[model samples]
Target: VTADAALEPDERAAWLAYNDTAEDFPGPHLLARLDAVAREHPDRPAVHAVDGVWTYRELHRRADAVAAFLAARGVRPGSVVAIAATRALAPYAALLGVLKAGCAYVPVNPDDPADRVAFVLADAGATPLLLDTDPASLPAAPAPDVPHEPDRVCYVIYTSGSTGRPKGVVMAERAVDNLTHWVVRRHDVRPDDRLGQTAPLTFDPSVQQVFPAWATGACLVTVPDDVQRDPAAFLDWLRAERVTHLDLVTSHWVHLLNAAEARPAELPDLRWIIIGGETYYYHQTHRWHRVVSSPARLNTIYGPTEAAVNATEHLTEPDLDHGQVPIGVPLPNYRLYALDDDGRLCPPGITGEIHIAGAGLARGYRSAEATAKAFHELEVHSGRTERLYRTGDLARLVRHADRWALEFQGRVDSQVKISGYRVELEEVDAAVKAVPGVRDAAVVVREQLVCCYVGDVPPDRLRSRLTERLPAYLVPHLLVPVEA
Candidate 1:
């Protein structure tokens, strides 16, 4: 049965009203908007980092040079280009260059082990671009103008898979372009705003840091590496840089608030604080209200990698009296629905799996099996089939005054967020079993990662072995020896 048919007349009407997010915006292409913004504000600071500052015009020139060099090497539209991303201006320039060349860019963390980096490059069939390459050393000729196609892939972001290997999620230009435009408009980002770049280059949230600021001719200020982990230093850096907009994971946000509670500082220029990457609670908001004097809007966003950077956002109210924060309604051009175990549409207050549809939906995963299993075409309404991503996340619809919002319940899967990085428990288990002297292993999350295994090897030796195989976040924080 169709979801709409099951609802009462008033309920159906409310549901439809909640999802009426379609709106006319600028182009479906990001590059077109970026080029226009740069041309209109040539001398404005585009990127500010410890290395140096690059004006909009200068940034465009470097990106154009990178694109020309790639085109000269026979790179064409629809191809994938791999970037060794770092905390510098060059990688950001290379990202624009790849898009300007009409190719999707895959960002690989340069600090990762060589083996994993090579595996990602090989799996994506991408040509690697080293960030250290000087743009002046490349061709000065203008790159051929490539027409933008909405269906064309824009970027490939790798995420942890249930299996031992990491899988790539391919996002289209339309998805990112829509998200970028929505963020810029929703936040009222201005040319004078300076957005803090806190997320890693490879993480999806970094997309928010780059495109939105550039779309409005705002400056993208890079937070120094040392300050990233030290909440006190990070807060100081934000004030020193006069950052107006900031995005951070919920855990990291809490850490910053903790620092603020101890050492308060006035941030007159800060205007927005966006939190995501994990479940948010009212206590977090309560702390923010009690600690922060700034009138910056505090918002919580939710989305998986399969969906674009963010799908739903809630403008958190200081007076919210709930235990958990609502994930809120869908963004413009996006649709979110909660369905039961039997694939039937769930009514309000009923827990069900969350399904997402609309412009923010990714093309699919790199693996055909994974893509087919997660994405499916559903008859959302009478005789109208729409492609929706099956988010393993559980949520429930709740009436909020004249509107409705989705409240997050736990996940149906074993995936957990460690410091905002998604880690599949099965993947960690597999990595643990592969370690020498490990016979059987099980991994779980209790505040932090815990691995219980029956192994003759010492815990320290096992940790050292796992360190080489998995990312630092995936390494089990506590290794408990178990009996066979």
Candidate 2:
């Protein structure tokens, strides 16, 4: 930790405003935003797909129809409505309808394991799984009769992790409402921005796509699961539809980038594209910047389901340029502090845990034990009470103006000491990414040793390549060939 330097006025103001936020979500329940959008932009293009297009008015009606249908099937305020579906305008409509009728929507990732799906459903106590295709594919799940408020539980999104059991992160209605407004402000999202949607409703980031698009009177084109291949076809779909905004996980983004490159001079209406869900390779960030001909905006946004998709958004622009892309600063409404073990703020340039407290923070998890650990209290500059998630991810405050800017160091849990040598396995993984022959790699912790999994690279060749940069002790216990 270094000595403190006085920040500029604007930066100070940003910090001040962030610290002033209250303990609870800033806005009303999710349906209130829906009502506002439905009332304000009824005639706007609310949803579009190959099947057809729905105006904001039509979207509202469709959502209401789904709500009424769910209500008739015993869904009421505070009921959990589990929805298993691919990405489409209708899935979003059903999700909103579930919330509108005062119920939480449980979105099951179409690709997730049946057992994992069962865990989330049983954990949230969801009932009435709204199926776009078939619910029978997932494991048998029992429903619960939870009675709370219209804004009690907004949605249950299952997050993929190293742990076999994918856990559900429940975002409350109030949290959703506040988050959309914050995202709109941070992104400067407008009525005219034609935001394209991907990421099946199962992914938590999809909500960031759904509410902000409708609320801003932007066109939402739901890409179908059918067109995963053929870059020409996908870019043609985006270009023909005039997609202006894009948001999806990093893996999906690689496909989209390939698709866009395959058809140059397409996507005429595209202006802003945000990427997240994992670290964007350093080259990928630069590649995106170099490839764009126009003044296309690229944002490397980061946040978890607990903080409503995006709590921090980093723009890869001239104002801030690091050799490697930094996740950048916390957007408005979130107080992002790098804290030490005792919850004291760590000085800039020092690596410490990243903790966040803000308007969009989720209500404590459903499980009492998890809630106790995640939703712990913190005393900010102001006397107001705030709760922060000890991200368990280490980060360092890189240079910035008054705004809080930080660099992502791996998860704190990922940091381990082997033979009195501390290491971040992600560093090793990043090194592998730099290797020409290596296509993909992941470093997993296996008792007292770090195991590296290489993709597409031959073992002996990859070992020699990695050894040039990495030490012998840091080498993997086993070197295996990656099948092409």
Candidate 3:
């Protein structure tokens, strides 16, 4: 829905004040931040799953022990460890342990095809690849005596590449720390807040799930793989788990709305519901208020994986009525721009491609060339050479509450978004062409991904091959051979 009205005088000032947070964000690794919280809430539950739970102290000890194990196996400063472990208590500890050991973490879904997992692990050069390991069994030892720089690489999240190969988005400790602070300060996170861990570790939003929950000494509730993708099951799990905080991609939220319509009063005990991953549907805002409890706050967040999972956030009001929701303003340390074709900033109501600049920007894609192609030097201010990420997404500056807020328009490229995840069509097209008997392939989005190919291979064989290399959603909903 279109947010035609500006925020009222009092509300706008409060928003501006909230955005202008003045506290000095600590310049430490996430592990350091977690340690500080553990000291305060050692007995507080840090993580919870269907099978088990970990207190803050226990989580830290497990991470410490696993760090020692990895350190003994040659993991040191600047090392990257590929974690292909399934979602479980052991993997959670290992994830933090890798960082505590002064190593970067690369997440690969263990369920992904072997070739796909092998390629990511090899490309990332992660050592002692953790898969199906009992992290708690590892002997407890001291953390490696390696320097842990605040700006050191923290995690390498692989995203779909235009060239068919996945590229790792390398993020530094500080970049994601910014995100943690934003979540904590903005949301007023408390120990009682149960963060619903819906996103997979491979997905960037998982940073939102893990770090902020850990930093605030809150409970991280891991949603089962089966429930996360199922709308009705997800609602049931959220209610059962008493998840206070939840984040869903736009499409997934759309699905949930449909499910909620069936039984609108069955909303969970959520205090905050975050919608992101794709464009926000304005009408959903009104429908959500109808179904969900009034105590919950609905926030519409906007950011790419390149920008540490969250850049801008708009808290939706209960009475909000429109089709387009403004993307809102930038986070504490980041800057955003709606620039015209000539690279000049667009005036209010004019559409332009969105460009983001800030400390939260990813170090860059693993490929230096691709990095150069996406990030460029721009004078965001007077006579300055600040690096900026030229996001392919487009937006417009809209007047909101006497302030200018950005309204998302669309994309400037052939990128497709499914359930809040960015899918590069070129990548899927390339996968289709990779089949032995395939000649050419092109993709289009109708209700879902569709690929029409010109090739000698039978459609069934090609579809089978696609499933092996691509994630389920990335695989086309329908594959058709072009008639000669």
Candidate No. with top TM-score: 1
Note the residue pairs that clash in candidate 2: 11-402
Which regions in candidate 3 have their CA more than 4 angstroms from the true location?
Answer: 1-23, 26-29, 430-444, 450-464, 477-484
lDDT rank order: 1, 3, 2
What tens-digit string does per-residue lDDT give for candidate 3 at 86-147? 56777788888888888888987776767777777777777744665667677777655666
Q: How close is candidate 1 to the true structure, as a TM-score?
A: 0.92
Give the per-residue Cα lDDT of candidate 2 at 319.
39
Model 2 misplaced stretches (Cα beyond 4 Å): 1-30, 110-112, 132-151, 162-164, 228-233, 254-266, 281-284, 318-322, 380-385, 401-403, 414-484
At residue 307, candidate 3 shows an lDDT of 88
lDDT of 2 by residue, 1-484 (tens): 1111244455445445434544343454455666677788788887776567788887666666666666667766777787755555556666766766778888765444454566777888887447543322222222233333644778876553323334567778666777777667667788887777765566666677778888778877777766644545766666776777777666556665665566554455777777765565556655554544545577887776777777677776643334666788775667787777766665557787877887667776667777676678776444545678767777777765455577777775644533223355666676667778677777665623444554666677777766765544355656654553
After aligning candidate 1 to the native by TM-score, how far in Å is the CA of 250 from where it should be? 1.1
Candidate 1 per-residue lDDT, tens place, 1-484, comes to 6755677777666657767889878663678789999989999999987688999998888888888888888898888998876777777778888888889899987767567788788778788754346543465667568876667888898887365557889999788888898889889899999999888778888898799988889999988788987899898888889999998988888888889999876788888987887787777787777777777778789998788888898998887645888899899999988888777767778889999999999999888888999899887667757799999999988976567998889899777788788777677888889888999999887736788999798999998888788777678888999896
**Number of the top candidate by lDDT?**
1
lDDT of 2: 0.64
TM for every model, in the order presented, reads 0.92, 0.73, 0.88
- Superior by TM-score: candidate 1 or candidate 2: 1
